[model samples]
Target: GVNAVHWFRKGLRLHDNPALKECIQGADTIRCVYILDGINRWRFLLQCLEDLDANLRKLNSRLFVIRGQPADVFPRLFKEWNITKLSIEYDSEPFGKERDAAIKKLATEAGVEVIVRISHTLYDLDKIIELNGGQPPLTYKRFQTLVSKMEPLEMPADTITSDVIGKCMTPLSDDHDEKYGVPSLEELGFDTLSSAVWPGGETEALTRLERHLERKARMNANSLLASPTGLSPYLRFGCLSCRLFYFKLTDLYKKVKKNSSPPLSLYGQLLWREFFYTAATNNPRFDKMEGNPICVQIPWDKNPEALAKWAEGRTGFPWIDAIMTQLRQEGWIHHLARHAVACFLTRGDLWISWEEGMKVFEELLLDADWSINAGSWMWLSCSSFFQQFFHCYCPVGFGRRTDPNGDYIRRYLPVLRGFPAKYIYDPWNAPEGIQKVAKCLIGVNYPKPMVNHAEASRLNIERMKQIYQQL
Candidate 1:
C-alpha cells in the first residue's frame, strides 16, 4: 500500500528514468510532478513539459505541474497524497544539492522513504572524484583516464510501460487541469507570439537521435559550416538518456564496421560533458570569476554598450555577428562558431568578462548546460582550464576559411547578401564604390567592425599575458 511520488527536475523524460521506475515498483499509487521555478518562460521548456504530459496520458497517468517553491509545494503534496515514498533524480550542482537535502529532511519528518538515483550523468560523479583522491580532476586528459579505468557503464534503464502503469493508480479528479495541467506560454504570462525552431520532449529527442545516426552512417566529410549535431538541446533537458545514446552509437558502429570499436571522438563529446559536471560539482562559484580558485583572476573591463553589441549581433564583424544572430533566432550554433564569438567577446577583442557571455548563452542557447557553459567560457577566455590566450580566433579570417563563400554570414544576415564573395566576410574593407554597388553601407546600413582585430587582439593578448604572469 505504498503511495509513491517521483519528482521531475532535470530528468524530464520517462524513458531511462530510474527514479520514475523506482516509484512504479510495488506502489499502489504514484505521481510524477514538475515544479516550475523562475526563468521558465522559455517556450522550449513548456513544450517539453507538454510532451511529457502527452506521453504520460498514453500510459494512463499525467504529470502534475506545480507552480511554487519546492519547499512550500512539497509539504502540501506530501499531505494531499498521503505520500509514503519519494523518488528523485540526483542533482550534483550546489544549489540542487541544498534543495534536495532540505526535501530529504522534510520527507523524513513525514515518514516518507526517499529513493535517489544518478540517471542524468553516465557515471556516478562521486566515484570519479573519490578515484581522483577526493578532488575533482581539473584536466580533460585526467578525467578521461579516470573514466577509462572505471568498470563498464551501466545499461540504460527500461522505459515505462502500460503494464507497469497497471500496477499503480494516479487518481485524477475533475479539477486536475485547473490545478496541475501544464500551462501554455500565455498561461505563464509570456507572449504566445514567440516560437522555438526546435520542438522539445522525449519523442522528438529519440526521433532526432535516430535521424542523426543514419546521417552519420552515410556521411564521410565533416564540414565546419554544416548544420550542428542538433542533439544537445535534448541532452541538456535529459530528454534523451546518454547511456541509451552510448549503446545505440556502439551498436551502429558494430554494424558499420566489423570487429572495430567506435571512434573516441564519437563518444568523446559526452565525456567532455561529464568532465565539466564533475569539475563544477563541488565548486559553487564555478560560474563567476571572483572567489573561484580555478578561474584566472583577470580584471575584465565593464562595457555594457560593447557587451550589448556582441549579444545582439551588431558588433559589425560579419562572422561574429552572423553567429550571434543564428544563436538568437535559432538558439543553436556550431561549436567552432561558438569558439569564434566567445573568443571575440573575451580576451580576443572586447576584453569583456566571460561571465557576461555565459549569461547571454544561458538565455538564448537551447542546449546551454550549467557546467558546460561556465567551463567553456573559462576555456575560451583563458580564465581557467585553458591558457592559450595568444591563439585567438581571427573574426574575419576564421569564418572565411570555413565558409570560403561567406554563405553562413549571408544566411543569417541577409542585408550582407548583396555583397560579393570577396567583400562578404570583410564588408568594411570594400571600397566606397564597391559598398554602394552592394547597397549595404558598412557604417550606415550594417555595422562597422566594432573592434579592429589586428590592434585589439594584440593589446588584449598582452593584458592576458600580464594576468597569467601574476599567477
Candidate 2:
C-alpha cells in the first residue's frame, strides 16, 4: 500500500545521498522523481534534469521526468500508483521552505507520509548552534575555530542495485528541444549575440574538481581566503556532496600538513562558508541590507545607465571591468575579484543599496550562494558593521596593494592589453598617447568614471558619520 518515492530536487548523486539511500532500503519499488517546475524556464531546468539523468544512469536508473507544479504532479502520481510515502532533501531558502510546507500539508491530506531530511549543508544547523552553546558567531575566526574541531558527516556508500524497478516515463519536451545538447541563449529566451560558455552537468563539475585539486590547490595553499570555484557549482547543483568535499579537504589538510609547513587552510574556508550560512539563516534581514542599522538608509544613486555599464563590463575602471568581464565570460569571478568589485560598487561609487550589487552577482555567479554573496555585499556597503573599528574595504587601495601589478586585471580586460603597467590599475589618468596605443580610447571605448573615487570616499565617510550619530 505504501510505495516510496525519492523526490530529487538538488541532490543529484547516487553516492552520499542519505535520503535516497534510506528510501530505497525500505521500499518495494523506489521511484526517482524530478519534476521540472513550470515556473522555471526550460533552459536551466533542462540542464539540471540532464545532469540528474546522467547521475541516475550511473546506477542503472533514470529520472522520471514530470512537468507542472509539484502539488499537481505529486497528487496525480500518487493517485495513479496508489503510492503513500515520499522522501526528499529539505531546502532552506524561503521559496523552497514555503513550497515544502504546502507539499507536506497536501501529502498529509492524501494520507501519505512525507519525510524531509537536511542534506544540503555541510553541518546541520541545529547541531552547529548547539555546539556553539546557543550563540551564533559574529566573527570569522571564532566560527572557523568551532568548525575546525567538528567532524564531517560520512558519505554513504555507492548504491549497488543495478535492477531499478521504475519504468522509463516519457520525458517532457520544451520549445527549444532541437537545441538539446545545451540551450543557446536565444533558445532560452535571452539575447544570444553576447552569450558566453557555461559548462553544465555533473561530468563537467567532476572534471573541474579533479583539475583544480591537482593544480589550483597548491596555488591556494598560502592564501587565507581563496575562491573554491570548482566545488561551488557542484554544491549549487548538489551533484557533489558537501560532506564528501569536507572529508576530501580534511584528508588533503593532513597530507599537506605532514609534507609542508602549514596546512592547506581549506578547513578555515569551509568553516567560513558554514559561518555565512548560519548568519544568513539566523538573520534574514542581513540578506536585505548590512547587519548594521546605522547606514541602512543611505541614499544610493539609481542611475540605470551607470548600472547597465557595470553589468556590461564597460565601467572604464580596468580592475572592476576585468572582474565583471570574467563573470560574464566564465559565469564566475575570483574571490578577491568579487570583493574588489563589490567594494567599488559600494564605497568607491557610494551606492546605498548593496542589494543591487547582490542582484548582479546572483545573475552571473553560477555558484552564487545566497548567504555568502549577500552577506559579503552587505559587509562591504554598510559602515555600521564594518566601520565600527575600521574594517571597511577601499577598492582602489585594495587593488593597489593586493594586485599592485594589475596582472589579474590585464588577464581579463583585453582592451587594456597595450597599456603600460603604470596605467593598468587607473587608466583614466594615463597619458593620452598611452590610451590610444592600448586601442581603447578612454571615455569613448569605455565610459568615463561614474564618480570621482576621492569625492565618493569623502562623501561616504561623511554619510557614515551622520548615520553613526543617528545610531
Candidate 3:
C-alpha cells in the first residue's frame, strides 16, 4: 500500500512548497512523479527540468520521470505501486485544465485520493472573480484598483521529514534517460540556428531579477515606461514562485518608498501582470478582443510579403528594424519596443494580420504572458478598441519623438551608426552629400521606406472613417 503520491507539474522548487508538504503529512512513504509531457519539452524546458532535479536531489528525493499521456501513465503507476493518494497544483491555461481533468477522472476510478493545490497566482482566482462581481475587467485601471486591495499570498513553509524518506521504487527505462537529458533546439524540432536565444532555469532567473533590481530599476523608474527583460520565462516554467517574487518586491517597495521619485510607478506595471492574469482566468475570452463583443470583427490584412518584412525586421524604418534586431539578439524585447514595432506593423505597413504578429511574439518573447501579450497586441491593432478613428503610426516621427538623436536605433542597426542624429531616423530624406558622407544609400544600404508615412497616415484615416461609417 502507498502512503502518498506527489505530482510534480510546473512547481519545481523545494522551498516554500505547499503541495509537497501536504503530500508528506500522515504518510509513511511518498512517490515523487514528474510528467514528461510535450509542453515540458519547450525551448526552455530542459534547463527548467534540470533545476527541478537539482532541487529534488537536495532532499534526497528522485523524481519519477514518466513518458506518455498522464491518464495512461498515472493509472498504470497507481496500480503497479498500489498508490493511495495524489496531489497536484492548479493550472489556468486551457490545455492544462483539460489535461488535469482527464487525470482526475482516471485517478478517481482507480480509488486514488486526489488533492489539487492553488500555487500559480499571488491572488487567488476565485477571490478575484468574486471581487469583480463575476464581470471581467475591460480596463487595466479597474483591475488594478481591485488588485491593490488584495494582499498577496505568502510562500508555504518547507516541511519534509527524514523519517519518511524511502528507497526509489519507480523503475527507470530508456525513455527516462532520453527525456531526462537536456534538450537542444534540434531535439525540440526547431531550426537550431534561428535568431533566438533561450534564457533558462531558476539560478539564471534569480540573477536576472537581481540585475534588473540593481541596475535597470533606476533608469526604468525614471522613464515611467515599463521595461521587463523577460522574467516571465521563470514564472511560466514555475521555476520561480510568484509568492517569493511578491515578498521580494515588497522589500524593494519599502526601500524605494522614501525617495522623492519612488519606483512605485514601475512596480505598478509588475502588479498589472497579476491583474491581467486574474482577469483572463475569470473570463476565457479575455485573450480575444478586450472582453468587448462589438470589437470582435475588426478587418485585418492578409498580405504575406509585407508580413515577412515585419518578421525579418526589414521594413525600411530604423526604429522598427532596431527593435526587431534587439529581439533577435536577445530573446526578449522591451515593453515600449513592443508597442512601437507593433504599431508600425499594424498601422504603418498595414499588411500583416495581428494574429501573425502575435504568434511571432508568442514564440520569441521570453516573458510572453498569454493575457498581456495577446491583449496588448490586439488592443493596439484592432480599430474598434481605439477611440480615435483609424490609428496609424509613423516610424520616422515616432523614433524622433521617443528616441531623438537615434541612439536606440543605432544600438541595434550598425548600418545606420554613422548617420547624424537628424538623418538617422529618416535616411531617405538625407541630402545627397550627407548620404554619400554617411556611406549609406536610402534604397541601397537599407531598403527604401516600405510605405510612404504621410500617404499611409492619410489612407489609414480614410479607412477608419469608412470602417466607422459601416459600424
Candidate 4:
C-alpha cells in the first residue's frame, strides 16, 4: 500500500515528466502537489501554475497546491498523506540546490523515499562539468562540443495515468486559510502586476513551440533578429520539455541542414541555455560581481535613482525606454530588444550594476531563468562572458537599423507615434516645428537622452581597463 507524492516545482508539464512517472510506478495512489513561495512572485509564474491545474484535471487527476516554504510544507504533507515515496524534478541553480538538499534531508528523516531526475535540461549538468575536467565549460563552443559527444537525449516519458481507487486527488481539508488550489491574483497579491500578455501553462507552451517551428520554416530568413523564437518563457519555467524541443529542432535540422548552423541556429540557442546553466552551477558567485572570479569588477554606479528611471522606462532614451515599456506591459520583449536595454543599463549609458538590471528582470520577465538573466546581463555589461567594452549598442543607431520607421518605438511610446521616422529614435533632435507637428515635445511629452552615449561609453573603456589591470 504505497502512497507517493510528486512535488511540482518548476517542471509544470505532465509530458516529459519522467520523475513523476517513475515515482508513481507500483504505487497504490499518487498525489501531486505544487508549493507556491510568494515573495516577489511574478504574475506570469502564477499563470503557469493555474494552467498546470487545468492540465492535470484533463488526465483524471488534478494538482494539489499550497503556499509556504517547502521545508515547512513538505513534512506536514508527507505525514498527512501518510506518504511512503516522494519525487521531484532536479532544479539546478544554487538556491534551488540548497532548498532541494534540505528537503531531501527532511524526507530521509521522515522515512519517505525520494526520486529525482533531470528533466529540465538537455544533459545532466554534472556530466557536462565532468567532461570539462570537473569545471563548467566556460565557452559556448566548448560546451556544445562536449554535449554533442554525449549519448543522444531521451524523449519524454509517456504521460502518467493510473487508477488504484482513483488518480483524482485534492487538498486533504479545505480547513485552509490561504488559497488552496491554483492561486488568484488576489491570493498571490499581484493585482497591479497582473500579466496582460503571454498566458501560462503547458497548453500555451506546446502551442507556442509548434507555431514557432512552423513560422521558422515559413519565414526561413537568415537574420537571427527576424526569426527569434518566443518560446523562451516556456523553456524557462519548464512548462515545455527541453529534450522534446531539442528532438524537434534536430528533426528540423536534418531536413534543412544546409540552412543553419551555430550562433544563429535555434540549436545554438539551446546550447547557450545549457552554457549558462553549467556556468551558474559551477560558479556560486554568479549573481554578483564582487567575488566572481570570472567577471571583472568595474565601479558600476548602483544608483537607486538611475535604477528607478530605467525600471520605469523613463531613461530619456526612446529606444531603451520604449522597449522597457513593452517589457513591463508585456512579460516579454525580443532578445535583441533585451540586449539593447541591458547594454544601456550597465556599461554604456547608466553605468549601473548589471546585477541590478538582472534583479528587475527576475521580477518582470516571463522568460526570466536565473542563469539566462545573469549570463546575459554580464555579457551585455562586459563584466563576465563577453569583453567588448568599447563596442556599445548605439542607442539611436541600433534601433533605427531595426525599425528605421520607428514602428517598434511608436508601438510602445504612443507620444512618439506621430514623430517622423528620422527622429523617432531621437525625438530630442526634432526641431520645434517637427515637435509641434508630431504633437510631442521633448522633455515635456517625451524625455531627452539621459546621457550622451559618446561620452558615457568613453569613460567605460578606461574603467574597464582599470578593472582588468587590477585583476
Please give the clash total of every predicted structure, in order: 0, 0, 0, 0
Question: How well does candidate 1 match the true structure in TM-score terms?
Answer: 0.95
Report the Cα lDDT for residue 36, model 3: 66
Please write out the lDDT profile of model 4 over residues 141-161, one tens digit for every residue.
677788877776778777655
Candidate 1 error regions (>4 Å)? 38-41, 193-195, 218-229, 260-263
Cα shift from native, residue 453, model 2 (Å):
1.0
- Candidate 3 — what's its lDDT? 0.66
Flag clash pairs in model 1.
none
Highest TM-score: give the candidate number: 1
- Give the per-residue lDDT digits (tens) of candidate 3, residues 402-450: 7776877777788888799988988888897888888887889888878
Output the TM-score of candidate 2: 0.81
lDDT of 1 by residue, 1-471 (tens): 799999998888988999889778999999999999723326778888999999998988889999999989898889988999999999987778989999999999999999999988989999999999999987888888898888888898889988867768888988998899988877877644444567778888988998889987822113433343478878889888988888888888888886355566779878888888898899999999999989988999999999999999999999899999878877777888888999999989999999999999988888777788998889778888765766789998888888887888788899999899999999998999998988898899999989889999999888878764465
* Local error of candidate 2 at residue 331 (angstroms): 1.0
Write the candidate numbers in order of decreasing lDDT.
Answer: 1, 4, 3, 2
Better of 1 and 4 by TM-score: 1
What's each prediction's TM-score? 0.95, 0.81, 0.81, 0.91
Worst-scoring 10-residue span by lDDT in model 2: 218-227
